[PDB]
């Protein structure tokens, strides 16, 4: 299947005292592999997956230098943005940045992205061609003109089409035992009688990876959304994910209903039915 490498950065200003809180995380697919937190003691980029621990000191030093540089740029940006938006020095504000690359099943470049937000709203983002920018408002439009004059998209494009892909492939190979493993959902259904006349069937999907999944209910072979509830996919904490979907049915008619589970780890979708 396809894969991605993505970095997420958050900086939150601290008007009362000191520097912004800065947190950076890096992911391959749904697996976190590095972190930086400006409040942690190490002041280093830190491994979060075993397969990254084999990189050598040259790697960690470079990632630490780069991540600190990113934090400094976000600190500057917080100041500049506070002035662009005519805001007080009293309030805390947030900059978020995400960038990375996707590869196809062939492990060749599919798409790149680089997006920036201020106070939780789009500010500026690279277009899919990696040559042009989308500015959300007139402040970001001044940024776009600056960045176009400085040819920043060309430098980012070189990273996103080239370096990013090369390193993603290295990590996929080095972390093969997990990163190339698909953990199909472990499924079951539970039954709960609300009254003598209606019952809730809950379809569980447990311990799966990657996080993408679809759970559908059908009645007599037709999709049913009324009388259903679907929770947001959630982390188990061990690197896998969980989800459930439930339907309310007339007691005695449970066997009409089927739960359909689609996931990359399943050669064909699973169908569950209460006749337990």
């Amino acid at each position: 299947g396809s894969h991605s490498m993505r970095y997420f950065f958050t900086s939150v200003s601290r008007p009362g005292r000191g520097e912004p809180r800065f947190i950076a995380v890096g992911y391959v697919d749904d697996t976190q592999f590095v972190r930086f937190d400006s409040d942690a003691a190490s002041q280093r980029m830190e491994p979060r997956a075993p397969w990254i621990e084999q990189e050598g000191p040259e790697y960690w030093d470079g990632e630490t230098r780069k991540v600190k540089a990113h934090s400094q740029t976000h600190r500057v940006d917080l100041g500049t943005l506070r002035g662009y938006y005519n805001q007080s020095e009293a309030g805390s504000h947030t900059v978020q940045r995400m960038y990375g690359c996707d590869v196809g099943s062939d492990w060749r470049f599919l798409r790149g992205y680089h997006q920036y937000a201020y106070d939780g709203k789009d500010y500026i983002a690279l277009k899919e061609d990696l040559r042009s920018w989308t500015a959300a408002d007139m402040a970001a439009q001044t940024t776009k003109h600056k960045w176009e004059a400085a040819h920043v998209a060309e430098q980012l494009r070189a990273y996103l089409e080239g370096t990013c892909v090369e390193w993603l492939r290295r990590y996929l190979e080095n972390g093969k035992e997990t990163l190339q493993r698909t953990d199909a959902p472990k499924t079951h259904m539970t039954h709960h009688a609300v009254s003598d006349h209606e019952a809730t069937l809950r379809c569980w999907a447990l311990s799966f990876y990657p996080a993408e999944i679809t759970l559908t209910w059908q009645r007599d072979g037709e999709d049913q959304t009324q009388d259903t509830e679907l929770v947001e996919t959630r982390p188990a904490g061990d690197g896998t994910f969980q989800k459930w979907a439930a339907v309310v049915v007339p007691s005695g008619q449970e066997q009409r209903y089927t739960c359909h589970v689609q996931h990359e780890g399943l050669p064909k979708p699973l169908t569950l039915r209460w006749e337990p």
Binding site: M5, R65, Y84
Partner: peptide, 10 residues
């Protein structure tokens, strides 16, 4: 592997 080493400011 992060981008860098330069990322211009806004």
């Amino acid at each position: 592997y992060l981008g860098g080493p330069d990322f211009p400011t806004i």
